[PDB]
Symmetry: D2
Subunit: 255 residues, 4 copies
């Protein structure tokens, strides 16, 4: 693992399930003091939790102020909380489109804005933003989601440039990962049949050169690496955890 993460205060947003929970658990395994900021209670977890809606800047500020007071520092912030709904720009209501931007982009902006002042009071703090392989190659009927993930890359570069060399900021760009959100995405297409869901997921996995979809722990490994001193000269970039998806053209060749 990354020994330097031990005992450091790590905040992870949206860590009650899926990738966020996997990230929180990895940091706990690294020995960090982890706090989850989410609207849902992670239940019996080894990490701390504060009820917090990332779209509410006042609650985000209060939660972060509380963490600094309780723990004495903040060394790592992982922005992960996000949502996805589908629809053509003409079908999705303007409210829902804006809501996706609010959670996926503004949530990252608020958490970063309020954590940074405290983070720079620590040695070599690091922010990791979870974007998507869709910051590059995109899906249909996902206007708001795709727009928000591209925005996250811009926010990431900005924070990196504005605060270097004291604080580093990078993003992780995952492709299809085995999470509740993805299983739900499949159900929205094939129904509740566990057999038919495995088929749709297998189809997606076969589209990735690695021939399977990713695991939450694989995204968590990239986050831990970027948050650690092992990435001391890495800032402003997105580490793609996509099983090769973003470099594959879907055009057959003779074999």
């Amino acid at each position: 693992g990354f020994s330097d993460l031990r005992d450091k205060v790590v905040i992870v947003t949206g860590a009650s399930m899926g990738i966020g929970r996997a990230i929180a658990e990895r940091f706990v395994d690294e020995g960090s003091k982890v706090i989850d900021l989410s609207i849902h209670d992670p239940g019996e977890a080894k990490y701390d939790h504060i009820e917090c809606d990332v779209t509410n800047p006042d609650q985000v500020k209060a939660s972060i102020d509380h963490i600094f007071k309780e723990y004495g520092s903040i060394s790592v912030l992982v922005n992960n909380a996000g949502i996805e709904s589908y629809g053509k720009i003409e079908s999705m209501s303007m409210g829902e489109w804006r809501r996706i931007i609010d959670v996926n982009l503004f949530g990252y902006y608020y958490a970063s804005k309020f954590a940074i002042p405290y983070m720079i009071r620590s040695r070599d703090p690091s922010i990791v933003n979870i974007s998507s392989v869709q910051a590059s190659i995109i899906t249909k009927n996902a206007s708001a989601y795709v727009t928000s993930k591209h925005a996250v890359i811009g926010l990431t570069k900005s924070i990196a440039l504005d605060y270097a060399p004291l604080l580093r900021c990078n993003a992780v760009c995952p492709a299809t990962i085995d999470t509740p959100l993805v299983r739900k995405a499949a159900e929205l297409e094939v129904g509740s049949d566990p057999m038919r869901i495995e088929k749709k997921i297998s189809e997606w996995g076969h589209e990735h050169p690695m021939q399977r979809i990713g695991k939450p722990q694989e995204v968590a490994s990239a986050v831990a690496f970027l948050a650690s001193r092992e990435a001391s000269f890495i800032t402003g970039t997105c580490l793609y955890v996509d099983g090769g998806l973003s470099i594959r053209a879907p055009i057959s060749t003779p074999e």
Copy 2:
């Protein structure tokens, strides 16, 4: 020139000055029927103008309706209206940060959302979004601006994917261009002395491989190309009009 642009209905937002004006002027020269949507009166101009705030969906929808019923179609929409102010995520007020996102991103979303239903009723319609070289290489203390320009790329790709093959959508990514906004940027750094402002602009020009900053008409040439049938198999991309800025590492080598 592009003969196919003659008589086509072209909407350009923020065309009362700078790049937007050069774009409207180029389409007028191509024989198109051009309408400028902006909150400012362009004064004496060879193109039509409608008082419209791009961040007000009611005004945008109404303006687009006035154009379609009056002209009979809408073939090209050029989203250009934008703004920029500086400050670290820490100093800039949340309100100003949100405003930059509202104008630079939501303005593009509203105009596209309301124009698309009309545009798809015409043959080979196209949307061109003005992003920035900062969708790739960025500047300091410009997080809202940088985020918004990255967001525009995501919006562009999604409209391109959701509406191909009937409608194409691309972006233009300009570096430093001679515009009032760029002159305001210089002033905010070196004062109001017009001569010092010229020295600053020259410094920026020398950072571009082309050794000068770009001209509004050069951005307009790219927009006209992408809007034309000459770009019939081009969609979802950003055409960089940056004088080589984005491919240059600021690291000297032996000469």
Copy 3:
């Protein structure tokens, strides 16, 4: 069209068929004085031809020296000559792998190296290199081809930076285009049945968001634009002519 191209001397390599022939014909239509450098005679063509193997630097130099002497100048060079054979790095012989690099990369290097000295003696000369959508998203069993197309982008950036602002250099990145090479690629997979070939080609076309493969003339339009003064502030970039292929993730979403 691009009026500024009229009467200018334009050299196009590999212009006896496919994209190269389409590029040569477009420049002839623009009124340019065009010369094809290839090993095959274009037969009855409106453009000039010189028998030339781009992998032979001495023949390339001699041919270019001859053109400058005969025509008095060289304003545009379009590097297009290329080949493709398939095979895993373990199956393709080292000789064939090297041969692909020789034609696809070294051919561009030789033509550029010998034309540049003459080109800078003209006003605003421009080089356009034909790369591929595979400079970004790639196909399987195409190691040498993919490597060569990435190399072409590096060569393009280098020439652009080294000679700005006098000479511009850009690349065009086409996806699947209807050419003899592509039809042959299909035959290598489905056989000579015109019905089965149309099916394979249709399959490829459906993978592009535009739902069809591109036409040679569409690539030629991008080349003419980049070679013209309409692209006066564009240098070091690749204009993707891919029908949206490079921005598409092959992952379904609910609809």
Copy 4:
């Protein structure tokens, strides 16, 4: 550290000095069995070394055979051997230009070609290719070098796509790193005065957002991560270790 790297057989080319040496040294610290393939003797070193010219396929194949038969497997291949000389496409001899391509590209191709058949017989083998930040943003008078580094990216993607899921292949893209080659670059500009060389290096460091040049060990950290199981779903990508250089536009803004 990455516990999975213990006892794994790791080949590193050009590891007698600089980045290559730091990479070999890091793998030795991880408990791997490391073999350096280079034409130079690393002298006193904690890792094994074989006299081998990476541009000589007979020597490469023989060395890889000596390693597999002696150690029983090959789990990781790090292609690093490279060189750089300066000059415009016009001045540099064709022989020197070809040589840079031979070492920087063909050396990677030969080592990969001969190691792959052995590597795929082990579980989860991985190849890491050292490219450069110049696979994106480039320097002047370095066409052969720049071309070769872009070529390495194409080679990387193709090996990743052709051999997934059994073997992964990624690249590391370093910006300015403290190495002898970087010190030679400074000398070729400011002379042999060690103090002036330090001033030059400092200038380059200040161009990176991190305000310093990178350390060989920082590149090694990235290589070890990509070679490890921690990067199990990461393939075909380039991890930028550039201190933010590639996302920085050299354009000032108000402060």
